[PDB]
Ligand binder design. Structure first.
Ligand SMILES: CN(Cc1cnc2nc(N)nc(N)c2n1)c1ccc(C(=O)N[C@@H](CCC(=O)O)C(=O)O)cc1
Length: 947
């Protein structure tokens, strides 16, 4: 078998994940296929995780049925995992208490600089001890966290597998009456969507009691430093809760109505791609073009508002750390107290540790718990029924299509000012403290120091909103300008491009690639850019105070570039492995429920359980590597993130004769916030480069094959088709320019007022002549028609002056007035005349509207009869000379074909009919008959010499 190195591995080797080093060496240069993944632990099998939960549930059902109450499933999980969760909670409490001691010991180092004496050896040792104590909370938070996180993540897959095991076990005991209601789709959905919500619940389950505790623990510490002025900092942070939720209820609505404009358009596409040979033959491209162009404008106008709302939300999330500090400190100063550099940065650190945690971790645990409870209720109600007895080019082509190169310089200059203001607003307070500490009653005027601070506070918000708005607009304009190019490039492709590519591929592209281009790209781009810009500012602030922290920065930054690549090279296969191991489980589940009555004949219902367990163990193995490979990188990242802080603190302490308290506090208060932003910035690039593939495959289009232009300046006479004379010569045809033939050298010439017919068996080149004079694939061979040719004329002025009767009639979703005449070139009464001349006016007045009656789903309300008859009515109203009749019959012998053939008898007056015959008797009193066998003709004038 495949033993895993997770076991038989001592301590101090599982905190750094040292047992996963060899696997990387295999994934770096060999592309492991399926047999380089380790097995699962003996306590992670399906049969072990399912039987104990089944026993607990069977005991709970009896316990809750003997006494008159309802059986509950939520208790059967707490009766099992309570010990594990409360054991894990110890480290949660430890790491939550460790995040409060750091700002307490941060303020004790600045106090040493505030009272400095160059001849003193007792306080330096105390400062070193304080630094050593502070240098360990970071290590505790950075190193020992990734094992507890892996454990709390693994604590969910066990339940996820145990639920599916008993679900499948129950799915084989359903009666014939209970199965008549329950479909296979809802069962595979319950097993495919409702059980996947148990993976992210245990991660956010510990915030419901750690939020309010930490809030009070920090609020109690602010009173000892500043006083009442902390309330002015806590009164704003609460207001952010109802404001960010109410507007949420305003956003979701704007997301729903847009769907109404998104699906319908797609539906229209499903009717233009299926039937190109009819739309292109009738020259009806402009109608569908105008019908499609109108919906995209409304879709963009509805998307812009939601984009602006999301941009405003992000701008409010960016610069929310400046209002609280400004308010609390102007309140603290206006009361009559003196500002010092010992409490400012401590309060800043406390506020920054509180607000993010609260406003990002509290409103999500409730959603997670609600989804989990809904899923658990569904699964419980299900089990209670009775039983039986890329590259730089991909970015350049995507960015340069949005705006000119001036807007890019403008947005760069706009992005490179918000961070400068963000840093200067906090530097001004350090300058104020340093200027105040140098006094000996010669007080400081508040006007200047309070006006500069307000200006620096307002500029930050302004430059934070403008950048987001501009970025969102520029990135939406790109999709707006690419969708067009896609449409007018795909609309002009020849029939050879549609006869080989499936419709589902094109529809899937047009839907999901444009959805990705419109919805999630600008948000992720802006978030990544903001999180990346937030780190260079911290690095520059750290460097500008101590210029000697630029020497180790190069070795600390060189390692990351290689580490990211060395990780991705082997991490870019776990997703494929997981999907390939996950799909067969659903496949087997869906295919095993149909042939179920034969599994009851031979009473073997436990072998299928073992097969299901074996199928799920592969997905379990493929999922076990994901968490470990994801945690392998965070430890090495946090190592550098903590070494940076250690170096900063110690190098700043060992230079206590050059610097002062304000700037050491400033440099120390920023280094404690890098660990989260670095992780977020590293994470966002993954999704960016993952979703750029849709952009790249969108740009794959917009440059395809193209037929001849629609029209030239070679205008034919306005009365060109006055007489039907079609000559021929030895023409050879090939669909592809280098494939086989389907037809060979039809040489003839058709007279005017002549009813010519062709006799042949299906497959000998009989159904390809309509593709010749319609030039669907421009061949060699010069075809003269009425003093002009068929090659030096545009495609529209050649197919419009010709009529065609299709084999199988097609109808589009619209009005009866538009289906017979999209481009209005006639009056009102002529439509009634042409429709009664073909003898159908029952259905119209049997219906109310009878002129604007919309159809539905390809007009299934009608039959082949009136469909063929309305195609005949189109041929009637066309008012044309050349008529090509095709015959592919599946209809019945009664009055339909008699009526249509009599109408083609008397209605058509002396107009050059070219007919294709499938039954030898449909030709009645023909004038010219040709027989076309397996590659040429034996043609004669009259049928009297044939037989
Ligand atoms: C706690 N937190 C949420 C978090 C952290 N910092 C923030 N910083 C800002 N400015 N805004 C936030 N939304 C924010 N959110 C985090 C922190 C790290 C990762 C993270 O990088 N996770 C990776 C681990 C790293 C990796 O595998 O590459 C993963 O496997 O999913 C996720 C969320």
């Amino acid at each position: 078998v495949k033993p895993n190195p997770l076991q038989d591995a001592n301590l101090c080797s599982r905190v750094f994940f040292w047992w996963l080093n060899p696997l990387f060496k295999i994934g770096h240069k060999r592309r492991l296929e399926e047999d380089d993944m380790y097995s699962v632990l003996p306590e992670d099998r399906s049969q072990h995780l399912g039987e104990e939960l089944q026993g607990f549930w069977d005991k709970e059902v009896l316990r809750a049925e003997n006494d008159a109450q309802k059986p509950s499933l939520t208790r059967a999980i707490i009766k099992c995992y309570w010990k594990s969760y409360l054991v894990l909670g110890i480290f949660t409490l430890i790491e939550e208490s460790a995040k409060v001691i750091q700002p307490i010991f941060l303020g004790k180092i600045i106090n040493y600089f505030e009272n400095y004496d160059p001849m003193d050896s007792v306080a330096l040792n105390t400062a070193y001890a304080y630094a050593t104590v502070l240098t360990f909370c970071t290590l505790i938070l950075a190193i020992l966290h990734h094992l507890y996180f892996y454990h709390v993540q693994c604590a969910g897959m066990r339940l996820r597998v145990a639920m599916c095991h008993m679900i499948y076990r129950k799915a084989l005991r359903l009666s014939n009456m209970a199965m008549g209601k329950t479909t296979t789709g809802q069962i595979v959905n319950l097993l495919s969507n409702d059980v996947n919500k148990f993976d992210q619940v245990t991660v956010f389950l510990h915030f419901l009691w750690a939020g309010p505790l930490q809030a009070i623990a920090v609020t109690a510490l602010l009173w000892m430093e500043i006083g009442i002025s902390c309330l002015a900092g806590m009164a704003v942070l609460i207001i952010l809760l109802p404001l960010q939720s109410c507007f949420g209820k305003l956003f979701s609505s704007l997301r729903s109505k847009t769907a109404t404009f998104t699906d319908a358009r797609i539906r229209t596409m499903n009717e233009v791609i299926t039937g190109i040979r009819i739309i292109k033959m009738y020259a009806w491209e402009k109608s569908f073009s105008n019908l499609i162009t109108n919906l995209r404008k409304k879709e963009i106008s509805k998307i812009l508002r939601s984009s602006c709302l999301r941009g405003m939300n992000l701008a409010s999330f960016f610069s929310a750390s400046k209002i609280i500090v400004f308010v609390t400190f102007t309140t603290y100063v206006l009361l009559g107290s003196v500002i010092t550099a010992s409490r400012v940065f401590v309060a800043v650190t406390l506020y920054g540790a509180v607000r993010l945690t609260v406003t990002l971790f509290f409103p999500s645990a409730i959603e997670r718990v609600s989804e989990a409870i809904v899923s658990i209720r569904r699964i419980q109600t299900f089990l209670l029924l009775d039983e039986i007895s890329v590259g730089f080019q991909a970015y350049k082509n995507y960015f340069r299509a949005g705006a000119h190169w001036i807007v890019f310089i403008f947005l760069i200059l706009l992005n490179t000012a918000a961070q400068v203001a963000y840093v200067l607003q906090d530097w001004w307070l350090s300058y104020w403290a340093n200027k105040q500490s140098m006094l000996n009653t010669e007080k400081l005027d508040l006007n200047w120091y309070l006006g500069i601070y307000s200006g620096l506070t307002v500029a930050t918000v302004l430059f934070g909103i403008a950048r987001s708005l501009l970025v969102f607009y520029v990135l939406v304009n790109s999709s707006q300008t690419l969708h067009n190019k896609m449409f007018e490039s795909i609309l002009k492709a020849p029939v050879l491009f549609f006869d080989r590519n499936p419709i589902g591929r094109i529809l899937n592209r047009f839907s999901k690639d444009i959805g990705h281009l419109d919805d999630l790209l600008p948000l992720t781009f802006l978030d990544f850019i903001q999180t990346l810009l937030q780190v260079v500012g911290v690095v520059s602030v750290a460097v500008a105070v101590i210029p000697w922290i630029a020497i180790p920065l190069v070795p600390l930054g060189i390692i990351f570039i290689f580490l990211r690549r060395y990780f991705l090279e082997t991490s870019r296969d776990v997703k494929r492995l997981e999907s390939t191991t996950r799909s067969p489980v659903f496949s087997h589940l869906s295919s095993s429920l149909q042939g179920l009555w034969t599994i009851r004949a031979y009473k073997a219902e436990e072998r299928c359980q073992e097969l299901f367990d074996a199928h799920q163990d592969l997905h379990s193995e493929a999922w076990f590597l994901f968490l470990t490979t994801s945690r392998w990188f965070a430890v090495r990242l946090d190592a550098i993130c903590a070494m940076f802080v250690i170096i900063v603190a110690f190098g700043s302490l060992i230079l206590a004769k050059t610097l002062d308290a304000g700037q050491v506090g400033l440099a120390l208060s920023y280094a404690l916030t890098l660990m989260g932003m670095f992780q977020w910035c590293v994470r966002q690039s993954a999704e960016v480069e993952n979703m750029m593939i849709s952009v790249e495959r969108v740009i794959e289009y917009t440059d395809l094959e193209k037929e001849a232009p629609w029209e030239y300046q070679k205008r034919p006479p306005p009365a060109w088709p006055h007489e039907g004379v079609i000559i021929f010569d030895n023409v050879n045809f090939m669909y592809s320019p280098g494939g086989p033939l389907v037809l060979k050298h039809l040489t003839a010439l058709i007279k005017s007022q002549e009813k010519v017919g062709i006799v042949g068996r299906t497959g000998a080149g009989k159904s390809s002549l309509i593709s010749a004079l319609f030039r669907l694939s421009e061949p060699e061979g010069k075809i003269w028609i009425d003093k002009i040719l068929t090659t030096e004329i545009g495609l529209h002025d050649l197919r419009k002056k010709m009529s065609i009767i299709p084999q199988e009639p097609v109808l589009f979703t619209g009005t009866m007035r538009k289906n017979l005449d999209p481009f209005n070139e006639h009056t009102d009464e002529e439509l009634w005349n042409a429709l009664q001349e073909v003898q159908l006016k029952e259905t119209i007045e049997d219906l109310p509207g009878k002129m604007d009656t919309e159809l539905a789903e390809s007009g299934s309300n009608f039959s082949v009869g009136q469909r063929q008859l309305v195609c005949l009515a189109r041929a009637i109203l066309r008012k044309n000379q050349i008529l090509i009749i095709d015959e592919a019959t599946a209809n019945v012998d009664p009055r339909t074909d008699e009526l249509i053939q009599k109408k083609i008898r008397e209605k058509f007056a002396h107009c050059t009919v070219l007919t294709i015959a499938h039954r030898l008797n449909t030709i009645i009193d023909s004038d010219k008959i040709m027989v076309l066998d397996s590659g040429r003709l034996k043609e004669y004038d009259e049928p009297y010499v044939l037989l």
